[PDB]
Amino acid sequence: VYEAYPEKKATLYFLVLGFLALIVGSLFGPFQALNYGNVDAYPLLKRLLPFVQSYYQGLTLHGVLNAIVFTQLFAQAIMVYLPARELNMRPNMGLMWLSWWMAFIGLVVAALPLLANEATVLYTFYPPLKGHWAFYLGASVFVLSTWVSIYIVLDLWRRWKAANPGKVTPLVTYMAVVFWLMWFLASLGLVLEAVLFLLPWSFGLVEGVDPLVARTLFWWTGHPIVYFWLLPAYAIIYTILPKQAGGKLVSDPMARLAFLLFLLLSTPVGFHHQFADPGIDPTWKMIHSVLTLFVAVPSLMTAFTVAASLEFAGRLRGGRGLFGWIRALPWDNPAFVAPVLGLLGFIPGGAGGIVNASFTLDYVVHNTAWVPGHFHLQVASLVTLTAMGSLYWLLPNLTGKPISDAQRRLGLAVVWLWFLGMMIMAVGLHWAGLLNVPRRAYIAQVPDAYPHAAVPMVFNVLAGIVLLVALLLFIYGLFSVLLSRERKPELAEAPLPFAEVISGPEDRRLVLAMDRIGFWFAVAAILVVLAYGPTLVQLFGHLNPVPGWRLW
Amino acid sequence: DEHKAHKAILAYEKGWLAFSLAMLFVFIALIAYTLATHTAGVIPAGKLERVDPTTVRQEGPWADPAQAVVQTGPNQYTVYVLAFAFGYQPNPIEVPQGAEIVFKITSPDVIHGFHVEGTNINVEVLPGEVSTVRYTFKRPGEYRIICNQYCGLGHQNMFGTIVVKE
Amino acid sequence: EEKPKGALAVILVLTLTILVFWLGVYAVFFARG
Ligand code: HAS
Ligand code: HEM
Ligand code: CUA
Ligand SMILES: [Cu+]
């Protein structure tokens, strides 16, 4: 199963690495929820993990392993592996293993300084806060992994396109190609930041870095990167979930359209993270706020297409009136349940997001506990659930070890607990945010500073406990699936459960237009040049580098 | 059937789309509204104003805290604030209600938040740059300032005070 | 078969939850104006 599909192996190493990251990163979660419930569990944690020197070292670890490391590794797994099995083509395995070593070496390189308290700068690493050089080199090598991944999938696409002159790009491949193309355009920000600034800085080659350019370049990457976390989930939710649900994807071209739109509008909207910033024209902020509302469109589409598919699925399974279908879906199946719950939470989640994006409204909530509120419904829930669920079809496909009734049932617990835990925590944080509770703060070490957030603090406490269980159960579940010597090869040679796709007459012309990838890419690049071009030119004429500090 | 629900689903897909745009356009309008009133003062100035963070407390407007406040209109007061590793200068700030306060804020070390609890004042403070924001307190009393941008180990305790004289 | 009540429901909920959040935060913005 390795030697005609060694892409299976490679793929399996990316997942394991990602899920190991997630486990280590999450540990810090419950503690941080208690802290937001006004309880200080950090001596207890410090007694358990004697390297941990502060709340903020913990928070950095959390954000770096969970949000950057787990999520990229999961994307690299899904967004190479699915197009491979659909195409029935094998990725250039030389390059594949290169990208996996690059990420593992980059991860290890950067982990050392984090673990030694040399890089307590958080996953945004905003200069002048200045971490060890190995952090920036580590992170750089780790992110640059994705460039190899990009190549690999463009390769597969080119080769299929050669074997099938004339033919429209298969759907998952289409998705992965606009995905990887989008991510390339997106990553330029961070790469420029790293190459022009963070690296020379941390190597001692220069004494200062302009804070404002620093974060304007980061946010160039920093927004599309959450689409980079989302789409591998969306990939699975469009082309795999419907089949798990007992139905079909109700539209091929809506899915393409959506993914095209994200190619187009994910990058040029980063000032939405910079509304509170000096030295960026307010006009440019309005312009970026508009494009950010436009980027919300694909997920609005996605909500309909995905819900209709699930409805259809539910009707085929004998799904009664206005709500019967819901009950007729396979609530016995964690690969179905996990993403569906994800999607429910993604409703408040995106409403959160749309408020954030409306410029002046952002002054209400920016840097409050509301932001964490928002993005846990987004990545910690929808994405992470999706990843957790897919262990139930992906892992068996990769390894051949099938899933017991027991493990299926521990999964359901894990998934429901996590979901609920997250929902509770989302109320706490939003509420506390509304009460002006700042984010990124060890607030339990100042007991009397936030007396007015008495009750939502209770929720955060609750979610801390709830998600503690969820997480331990997940650790147990995961390893029990990976530490058995149950192997039936036959389902490791069974095909991915891709969905069938309802398709129509009008499709032909719409899909054709979308398949003009070279043109749409150029359009996307131009949209970046227009949106950041003018500002970047101005910043780069008036550079004011300032020296760095270490304040931990 | 099957094909029949295809047409129907694609239809209600243009409906939903067109509705979505229109509601998004309503937001755009209501936002453009807040841009046209007083409340838009909190929007940081866009024009670059460069200062040296290593000289900011020895020479110029941020050096002496006793000089912070300066009447600059018949109803306009510019307050020079400094946000630094682990508090605010001046402490408290002291300003009159019903006047337009033009905050001009910078940092001598790293990035800080400037969030005035109870208001729309919420602005990142960047070393090397001034954050200029305008506002008019209608209600007097003690407004608390919070740093909402992690600045290092004492970040959770970085607090200030505005005292708006009735 | 026919009209997708299910999704129409799902996006109805989705719509209302946006209006609650947005208008909600629009109100607080002005209260703090
Ligand atoms: C995966 C991770 C994330 C996703 C996805 C995401 C989506 C959005 N966000 Fe966000 N966000 C912002 C705006 C948006 C907008 C407009 C969207 C949109 O993309 C969201 C679109 C979503 C929808 C339009 C929802 C549609 C609903 C669907 C698709 C589900 C339907 C349910 C079904 C079908 C189930 C039915 C089944 C049944 C059985 C009933 C803004 C401002 O514009 C900020 C800065 C705030 C500040 O002040 O810093 C921000 C801050 C963040 C940060 C903080 C970064 C930091 O550390 O400072 C993170 C990590 C983050 C993550 C994510 N965010 N966001
Ligand atoms: C055990 C489950 C989790 C719990 C209990 C939890 C709890 C929290 C809390 C309370 C915060 C706020 C920290 C602060 O503002 O000081 C936070 C931050 C964060 N969480 Fe989680 N979280 C969990 C899992 C996840 C997952 C799975 C992800 C992404 C895959 C994630 C991504 C993040 C990120 C990026 C931050 C902020 C880092 C920063 O602001 O510097 N979390 N988490
Ligand atoms: Cu200054 Cu946080
Ligand atoms: Cu964003």
Coordinates of N, CA, C and O in Angstrom, one line a residue, chain C:
Chain C
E1 N -36.8 16.7 -6.4 CA -38.2 16.9 -6.0 C -38.7 18.3 -6.2 O -39.5 18.6 -7.0
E2 N -38.1 19.2 -5.3 CA -38.6 20.6 -5.2 C -37.7 21.6 -4.4 O -36.6 21.3 -4.1
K3 N -38.4 22.8 -4.1 CA -37.8 23.9 -3.3 C -37.1 23.4 -2.0 O -37.5 22.6 -1.3
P4 N -35.9 24.0 -1.8 CA -35.0 23.6 -0.7 C -35.3 24.4 0.7 O -34.5 25.2 1.1
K5 N -36.5 24.1 1.3 CA -36.8 24.7 2.6 C -35.7 24.6 3.6 O -35.4 25.7 4.2
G6 N -35.1 23.4 3.7 CA -34.0 23.2 4.6 C -32.9 24.3 4.5 O -32.8 25.0 5.5
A7 N -32.3 24.5 3.4 CA -31.3 25.6 3.2 C -31.9 27.0 3.5 O -31.2 27.8 4.2
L8 N -33.1 27.2 2.9 CA -33.8 28.5 3.1 C -33.9 28.8 4.6 O -33.6 29.9 5.0
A9 N -34.3 27.8 5.4 CA -34.1 27.9 6.8 C -32.7 28.2 7.3 O -32.5 29.2 7.9
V10 N -31.7 27.3 6.9 CA -30.3 27.5 7.3 C -29.8 28.9 7.0 O -29.4 29.6 8.0
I11 N -29.9 29.3 5.8 CA -29.5 30.8 5.5 C -30.4 31.8 6.1 O -30.0 32.9 6.3
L12 N -31.7 31.5 6.5 CA -32.6 32.4 7.3 C -32.0 32.7 8.6 O -31.7 33.9 9.0
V13 N -31.7 31.6 9.4 CA -30.9 31.6 10.6 C -29.6 32.4 10.5 O -29.3 33.3 11.3
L14 N -28.8 32.0 9.4 CA -27.6 32.7 9.2 C -27.8 34.2 9.0 O -27.1 35.0 9.6
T15 N -28.8 34.6 8.2 CA -29.1 36.0 8.0 C -29.4 36.7 9.3 O -28.8 37.7 9.6
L16 N -30.4 36.2 10.1 CA -30.8 36.8 11.3 C -29.6 37.0 12.3 O -29.5 38.0 13.0
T17 N -28.7 36.0 12.4 CA -27.6 36.0 13.3 C -26.6 37.1 12.8 O -25.8 37.6 13.7
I18 N -26.6 37.5 11.6 CA -25.7 38.6 11.1 C -26.3 39.9 11.6 O -25.7 40.7 12.2
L19 N -27.6 40.0 11.3 CA -28.3 41.3 11.7 C -28.2 41.5 13.3 O -28.1 42.7 13.7
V20 N -28.4 40.5 14.1 CA -28.2 40.6 15.5 C -26.8 41.1 15.9 O -26.7 42.1 16.6
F21 N -25.8 40.5 15.3 CA -24.4 40.9 15.6 C -24.1 42.3 15.1 O -23.6 43.1 15.9
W22 N -24.4 42.5 13.8 CA -24.1 43.8 13.2 C -24.8 45.0 13.9 O -24.2 45.8 14.6
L23 N -26.1 45.0 13.7 CA -26.9 46.0 14.4 C -26.5 46.1 15.9 O -26.3 47.2 16.4
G24 N -26.4 45.0 16.6 CA -25.9 45.0 18.0 C -24.7 45.8 18.2 O -24.6 46.8 19.0
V25 N -23.6 45.5 17.4 CA -22.3 46.3 17.5 C -22.4 47.7 17.0 O -21.7 48.6 17.4
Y26 N -23.3 47.9 16.0 CA -23.6 49.2 15.5 C -24.2 50.1 16.6 O -23.9 51.3 16.7
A27 N -25.0 49.5 17.5 CA -25.6 50.2 18.5 C -24.5 50.6 19.6 O -24.4 51.8 19.9
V28 N -23.8 49.6 20.0 CA -22.7 49.9 21.0 C -21.7 51.0 20.5 O -21.4 51.9 21.2
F29 N -21.3 50.9 19.2 CA -20.5 51.9 18.7 C -21.0 53.3 19.0 O -20.3 54.1 19.6
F30 N -22.2 53.6 18.5 CA -22.9 54.9 18.8 C -23.1 55.3 20.3 O -22.9 56.5 20.6
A31 N -23.4 54.3 21.1 CA -23.4 54.5 22.6 C -22.1 55.0 23.1 O -22.1 55.7 24.1
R32 N -21.0 54.6 22.5 CA -19.6 54.9 22.9 C -19.1 56.1 22.1 O -18.0 56.7 22.4
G33 N -19.9 56.6 21.1 CA -19.6 57.8 20.4 C -19.4 59.1 21.1 O -19.9 59.3 22.3

